[PDB]
Amino acid sequence: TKVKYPDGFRSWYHVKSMVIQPGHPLENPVGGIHHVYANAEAIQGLRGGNYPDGAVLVFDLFDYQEDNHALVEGKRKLIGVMERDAKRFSATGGWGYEGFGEGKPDKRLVTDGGQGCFGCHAAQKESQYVFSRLRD
Amino acid sequence: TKVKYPDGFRSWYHVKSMVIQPGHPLENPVGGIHHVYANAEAIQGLRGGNYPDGAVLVFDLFDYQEDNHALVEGKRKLIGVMERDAKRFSATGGWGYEGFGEGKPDKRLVTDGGQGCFGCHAAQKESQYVFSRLRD
Numbered sequence: 001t002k003v004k005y006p007d008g009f010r011s012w013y014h015v016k017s018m019v020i021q022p023g024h025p026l027e028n029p030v031g032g033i034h035h036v037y038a039n040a041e042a043i044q045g046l047r048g049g050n051y052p053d054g055a056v057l058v059f060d061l062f063d064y065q066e067d068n069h070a071l072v073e074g075k076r077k078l079i080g081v082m083e084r085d086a087k088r089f090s091a092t093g094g095w096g097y098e099g100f101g102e103g104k105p106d107k108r109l110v111t112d113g114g115q116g117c118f119g120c121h122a123a124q125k126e127s128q129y130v131f132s133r134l135r136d
Numbered sequence: 137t138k139v140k141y142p143d144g145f146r147s148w149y150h151v152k153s154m155v156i157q158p159g160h161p162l163e164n165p166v167g168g169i170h171h172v173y174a175n176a177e178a179i180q181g182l183r184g185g186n187y188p189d190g191a192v193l194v195f196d197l198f199d200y201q202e203d204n205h206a207l208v209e210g211k212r213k214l215i216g217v218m219e220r221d222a223k224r225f226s227a228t229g230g231w232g233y234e235g236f237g238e239g240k241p242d243k244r245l246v247t248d249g250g251q252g253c254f255g256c257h258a259a260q261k262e263s264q265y266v267f268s269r270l271r272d
């Protein structure tokens with residue numbers, strides 16, 4: 001009942017991006033440029049279907065350097081991961097929530113079984129606990 | 137001798153992103169959040185192989201809104217497209233250069249055969265006229 005490290009996520013579908021600048025209430029820990037990725041299964045849910053078991057969403061967070069009013073991607077800070085398994089992750093609404101420091105498989109960040117993650121994502125129950133919207 | 141509209145580019149590999157804010161020398165005309173995409177053939181070149189004919193790179197440019205210490209993606213402004221054809225695009229170093237306003241196939245922007253585009257990309261002769269670097 002741990003979330004698998006999503007190997008190959010950088011080859012997945014790019015859903016959307018956002019910049020969280022210093023002073024944002026979530027600057028700790030998700031300040032930076034983030035990119036959301038979806039595997040094939042997660043795309044089914046984003047397009048308006050039911051999220052199938054095996055759907056994975058990744059929140060890929062980079063530091064940035066402000067250089068002459070360009071924001072330039074620096075080092076990866078972390079990834080957030082939501083892995084769909086209605087039975088195995090039933091305590092957190094059928095998604096398993098994990099973080100990996102610097103996107104490294106060995107650097108697990110979640111210590112409360114994802115209850116804190118779930119606590120915020122629960123607001124989105126109506127879109128199956130996912131904030132990000134598919135855009136063209 | 138025309139660049140094809142890169143149908144389905146949103147499903148391709150996300151190379152990198154950058155934000156160009158007001159005050160940056162390039163605010164006009166590439167102000168905004170941009171995402172670079174690569175088809176399979178372009179990935180061969182980006183990894184340090186050679187670019188096969190049919191390699192396509194897309195510069196996907198979004199307007200953004202300031203939302204409480206977040207920069208949020210707004211409307212697409214345009215796409216830039218580089219299409220690899222060593223013979224057909226020999227006058228511009230084997231890449232065809234085109235722009236599509238709002239990413240619409242019907243709003244082609246380039247009027248000089250891509251000489252203006254090539255004029256800047258020529259600085260990157262040593263990396264086959266591509267600025268973007270593959271990152272993790």
Ligand code: HEC
Binds near residue numbers: 057098116133
């Ligand atoms: C509110 C206080 C949140 C907490 C705590 C957590 N997340 Fe979340 N997350 C939140 C928002 C508003 C967003 C959308 C970002 C965007 O660009 O629109 C996210 C996004 C994710 C995603 C991407 C999928 C999605 O739902 O859009 C993942 C994979 C994700 N978050 C994981 C995650 C984990 C692992 C958390 C606990 C460690 C966690 N988030 C907490 C809001 C909030």
Ligand code: HEC
Binds near residue numbers: 194235254269
């Ligand atoms: C210098 C004054 C430029 C001119 C004129 C044009 N482009 Fe360019 N381009 C430039 C930079 C600095 C970058 C890198 C952005 C980054 O995030 O690193 C780019 C990138 C592209 C790409 C992506 C592939 C790559 O080379 O990185 C494409 C597809 C592209 N540009 C297309 C393009 C076209 C069609 C132009 C004329 C309309 C054009 N560029 C002009 C710098 C400059």
Ligand SMILES: [Zn+2]
Binds near residue numbers: 205
């Ligand atoms: Zn403030």
Ligand SMILES: [Zn+2]
Binds near residue numbers: 066
């Ligand atoms: Zn600035």
